[model samples]
Target chain A: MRIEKWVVREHLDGVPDVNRVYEKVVEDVRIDLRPDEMLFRTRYVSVDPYQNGLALETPIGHHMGADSIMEVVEAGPAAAFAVGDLVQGFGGWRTHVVHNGAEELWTTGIFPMVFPAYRRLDPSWYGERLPVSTALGIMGAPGMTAWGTLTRFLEVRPGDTVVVSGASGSIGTLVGQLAKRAGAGRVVGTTGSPGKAEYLRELGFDEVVLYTQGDDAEKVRQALLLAAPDGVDRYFDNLGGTVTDAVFTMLNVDSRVAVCWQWATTVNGELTGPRLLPYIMFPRTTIRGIFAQEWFTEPLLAQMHQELGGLVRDGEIRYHQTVHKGFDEIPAAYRSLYLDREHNRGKVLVEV
Target chain B: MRIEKWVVREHLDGVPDVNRVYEKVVEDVRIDLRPDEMLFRTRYVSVDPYQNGLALETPIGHHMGADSIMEVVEAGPAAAFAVGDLVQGFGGWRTHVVHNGAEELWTTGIFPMVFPAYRRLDPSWYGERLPVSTALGIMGAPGMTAWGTLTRFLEVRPGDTVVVSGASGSIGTLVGQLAKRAGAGRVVGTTGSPGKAEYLRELGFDEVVLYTQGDDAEKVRQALLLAAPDGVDRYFDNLGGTVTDAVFTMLNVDSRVAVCWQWATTVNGELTGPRLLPYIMFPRTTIRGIFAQEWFTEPLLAQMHQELGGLVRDGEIRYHQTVHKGFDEIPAAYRSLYLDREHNRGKVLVEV
Candidate 1:
């Protein structure tokens, strides 16, 4: 069998330049599967902001880690999943993956986990309008991330204002929708582009804060003052920088902040802004740093998928994907998440 | 009756200069007392880093707020307090105060409270060797702040390494002591001076991080790496600048941080440092901003006093006071908290 995969040419510095940082190599391999092992061809690969840290943290000459939607091409006699089965699992940045049962797959993040190794997408569960690539977006890690963080960390009460940074991205979009569904008084999202702002407003966001308007923290502060007159009760911090600095000041007493993704920290090492201590002190805010895998258990994943899948199927929850064609575009697609925001919306993925 | 009080001469900026920011007033007024009102002469006033914010936030021409130990000199016919009674209450920055029972007194911080209005120090509860000024220091707001934050927000388990920043100040001093008493495996403290480092070592701290050694964040990071090799578990942050930026990197997974005070924010409005979002993400750290007055209930106060007073009297928990004499030294004493770190130790106080 022939396989192609991307490897780190060098440790990342500043912003990722696709050519200098990533190298894709073609190789020949033997598929000697055990009784429980199966082989699959990757169909779609997830491209996310977190992958920037992956490039920087992964050792030189090591394969970049990722989650992908793949279709089984070959299977052992005793394999649980047969050929033609669609599944989602950790397959790295490779054209194909060999699954040796549930124990072989691990999380894309630094944490080590064997549970929730892979989930098969059965045809009976959903209609044809729902794409299996969603297993990597809304119904997958990103969706569970929004669900787990909102349910576990923040209790969105009635009449409580909620703010989600990086609002046009996969998790941020769902967070805003779920917050509104959970009885939130208002949902505000911060984005870099006017197009993304309109997209969020169409998704029922009460206000869209364009952080790039003045590229100033004061501008965000003034925008929040108008959007959230009473003060924000729950802040879903996906982008940490001056936007977060402004939101920290306007937090209501007993406000909750769950830091999901700090996109700015990936490119800029120094995230200097206003000191949040004085602002946090008077409001008595609780800031918690969270990653989805921490709460990604088997039972919780089922609960999330069951609930979220219905929302998507019933047209209650809408998701968008910025799809790039072919495996060769993986590195460039991931890079676009940082360099270009106008073209990237919801989940960014490479359709292999 | 002759009254002397300190008023905010101007809105403070940067570091507080006592002569420029404060105006002392002297006036003679008739002691006209209503029923249930009692007059007292202030004996000692507390000087703390939080007072810097008080000076900056207090409106110009408004009386400065403070906690003081006083000796009752005169009382109304129906007053609960009598002449010559020693009591502690919110007396502002004045030599004399009139308290009309619990309703008349409130917290020095911005919160409104009537519960712990005034506490009479009976000789039976403590010995004469224990100074009454401790009511404003160890057994007062600082003590309650330390006790409540530790007991309510943090759960200091056995074998946990605890790090307390600004470890030489009044609240930091007690926090280190209480953490040691709570069966912490290793207690580390960060201070600016070598003398304060020695002071923390005597209080049974396993290691002392002198943040001023190289005056660099990397220096503090290296020191912490050597001191707390296992990683810091509970971070009681008092200073929020380069020192906090360093400690945020060395935190262990599931660590808890209680931001009691950020002295740097009081001086410099723009607190620029390394971004903490990346560090906080991997550890899943919980950072909470706390004000002691939230838990400053009558029952909690009595509980803290009983435990802390016993420790002080039995010599188990030793305390130090940086005392300045005369009511005229009040503004200078408060200003010294941020300006002069070497001379300020434990509770900084002004005696009248």
Candidate 2:
């Protein structure tokens, strides 16, 4: 038996460098299953910008953690799943994973989380046409985040104009589509490139603004003035900085903002911009930071999967995966999540 | 009859220059008693920082809006109050005001607001021990703000640490005292001078950080470290800038910030500060902009007056009014709301 994995080679500072921050290794696997143990082979792993933040927290020699799809190949008597059952779980970028039926092994001591570490994946949810890997992209964590944010956190009303930053990212794409399905009057998106902007429009976004133009508040403001003439009632902020500044200027009365990711400031270190308190005060705006897992109860997760999976199956939500083949492509795949935004679309993942 | 009032001579850009922005005018009073007309003599007017923002919005030659206490000296048959009745209402800084009992004449087409333009004052609320001016200060808008915020907006649980900026100002002082009464474990305040610091201590604040030290985020950080050692559970923000930046660093999980005023950024056009989205996200902090008037329903305001008034009568909440005698001192007193924080204690107002 063999296992392959990637670990943090060095702590990250700025933009992640594939060669400088990651190391891949292959090792022999030992099967000493406990009474409630199960062994699985990794099939697909998700690459996300949060991993860059993870690198800053993860110590050297520790395997980098990611959400992945795996198939159980062996199970002890007490294990809940049988052989060949596919499941979704958090693990390192390894070709194999081991799980204890009684408790999750990955996040037990490595990282604290409010979400269950693993859940059985129903391939039938995606219907026969979509691949099982879709569970890690559209019908998985990213899907739940988008569905929950639009439906629960901000409540996208029929006439609400919703604006989202990083519209080409995994979560942003779903948020735009789901908002449209929820009858948002207009859905505006900010993307990195013109190509990504085109793709966002095809995904049901009413308008697309290129954030790559410059981090000038006026530039984005001008774009929003024409795109969102009535102003933004709901903002799902994925990349914070000038994009958020521009959005703040156009926020209507009682507008709400969900601060999900600060990709701009996270990658660039500290960012100094105009103070936003005045913007918030005058409009009586409400800004709340949301962590997807915090709201992910078993019932909530199942409801999300059921709804989002039904959308995918019915072709109501379009999803694209930028897949990298081979476990060795993990570092490069993760790097592309930030650096190669021009080419990257939807969810970025590595097929093991 | 004669009327004396202060009007906007010029539009404001930055910190107000009393001479450059205000023009005093005297005019002959014309009283035409309609079916529901009433005449009043302004006795006391409240000076607050929100007027600074009002200057930028008010057109040149327009009288500035403020909350004032007036005595009705003449009334028509349909009027609600009789002669010599004391009332609290929004009006210009003037020696005389006429209101139609059928409707509020000042804010009709001038500035829309959610709060009723006028409310009959119960001098008994202060119980003869305190002057009627207390109605324009502690037991009025500022009191309602503090009481409503601590009790309703953000629940100040027992043992929770509460911190407020501009602690020596009108609203902050009440917030501190109210939080303590609500059983806050520790109450930390930030003021402008050491003398103000001493007064805040007397006001029941557990600690005080002088914001006049400088807008250095680290300086305030170190001060807060010693003051709120357990971390802040609720923050009442009046002045936004480095003080807020420092507060964001010490916020505990599930912390709430009531953004009341942005005095720092209001005077200084634009300020560049560290992006706070990261701080908000990691702690899952909730930031909400509060408008006291939005929640000021008739019943709620009466309840606030009833509860807070009882506290003042029982001597549970100490009240102060930095009274400027004479209506001619209006502009200077209004200007002092921003500049005279060192000498300022509770609420700043003018004795008409």
What do the candidate models score in CA lDDT, each in turn? 0.73, 0.72
Q: What's the CA RMSD for each of the models?
A: 7.5, 8.2
List ranges where model 2 is wrong by over 4 Å: A1-141, A157-169, A183-201, A206-289, A326-344, A350-352, B1-136, B159-168, B185-201, B205-278, B283-289, B327-346
**TM-score for chain A, prediction 1:** 0.79
Which regions of candidate 1 fall more than 4 Å away from where they truly are?
A1-44, A49-132, A158-167, A185-201, A206-279, A283-290, A331-346, B1-45, B49-132, B157-169, B185-201, B206-280, B283-290, B331-344
**In model 1, which residue pairs have backbone atoms overlapping below 3 Å?**
none
User: Which lDDT value does model 2 have at A172?
Assistant: 89
DockQ of 1: 0.15
Per-residue lDDT over A297-326 for candidate 1, one digit per residue giving the tens place of the 0 to 100 score = 667767776887878888898888788998
Q: Is the docking of candidate 1 incorrect, acceptable, medium or high quality?
A: incorrect
Question: Residue by residue across B13-103, what tens digits does model 2's lDDT show?
Answer: 5465787888998999678877676898998887876566566767788788778888899999998888988988876688888886332
C-alpha positional error of residue B247 in candidate 2 after TM-score superposition, expressed in Å: 6.7
Q: What lDDT is obtained when candidate 2 is compared to the true structure? A: 0.72
lDDT of 1 at A167: 83
